Design a protein around this ligand. Structure first.
Ligand code: MLZ
Length: 212
């Protein structure tokens, strides 16, 4: 557990208030189990809804892998992400499940492939998907404020970070102790940012500043 209180004191800094974030007041419970299948937007084509399997759990997050793809493009979603749903959600809504972009077979093998993987599959029930947190009505972040941020280059990691700059609805996230190489701009609505103390509360590891 990272001592934010001591760190905000020695850096003469403020943590961005919780109201800045599209996150729940309390970290949502994670009742997902490794092996459970669900529906997710393919990060490599966000128009596609694909079958994903939980290959890891960490705090309120799921590590996901798309069935029929590869093990090199896993992605992390919170249990209250709007980009994940129970199987059957896509169809109920007038849509069709797609092969992942990294699909290991030819496309005409898809319809039969879907049947094989869904056959007696462990599926996440709809009741363990958590509700979408309320969003801020505007960008309430201020320059200099600290937070917890997913390192998008190593998304398993949530790290000590600072708001460097603000342009309208975008905030510039910088990683304390790391070269500007891990910096990024994101929307203030980003699911990848959390108030200080959130990880400790969700049992997710929290990276201290880098040694640079
Ligand atoms: C913002 N977090 C940075 C983590 C980067 C870790 C990387 N493997 C390295 O050691 O460079």
């Amino acid at each position: 557990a990272f001592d934010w209180d001591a760190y905000l004191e020695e850096t003469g800094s403020e943590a961005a208030p919780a109201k800045c974030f599209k996150q729940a007041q309390n970290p949502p419970n994670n009742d997902f189990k490794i092996g459970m299948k669900l529906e997710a937007l393919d990060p490599r084509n966000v128009t596609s809804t694909c079958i994903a399997t939980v290959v890891g759990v960490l705090g309120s997050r799921l590590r996901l892998r798309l069935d029929g793809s590869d093990s090199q493009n896993d992605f992390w979603r919170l249990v209250d992400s709007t980009e994940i749903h129970a199987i059957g959600h896509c169809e109920k809504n007038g849509g069709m499940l797609q092969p992942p972009l990294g699909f290991c077979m030819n496309a005409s093998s898809w319809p039969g492939y879907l049947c094989k993987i869904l056959n007696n599959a462990m599926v996440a029930p709809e009741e363990i998907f958590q509700p979408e947190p309320p969003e801020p009505e505007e960008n309430l972040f201020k320059v200099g404020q600290k937070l917890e941020a997913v390192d998008k280059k190593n998304p398993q990691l949530i790290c000590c970070a600072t708001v460097d700059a603000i342009k309208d609805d975008q905030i510039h996230v910088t990683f304390d102790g790391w070269r500007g190489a891990f910096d990024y701009w994101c929307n203030y609505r980003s699911r990848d940012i959390f108030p200080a103390g959130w990880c400790a509360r969700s049992c997710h590891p929290m990276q201290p500043p880098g040694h640079k």
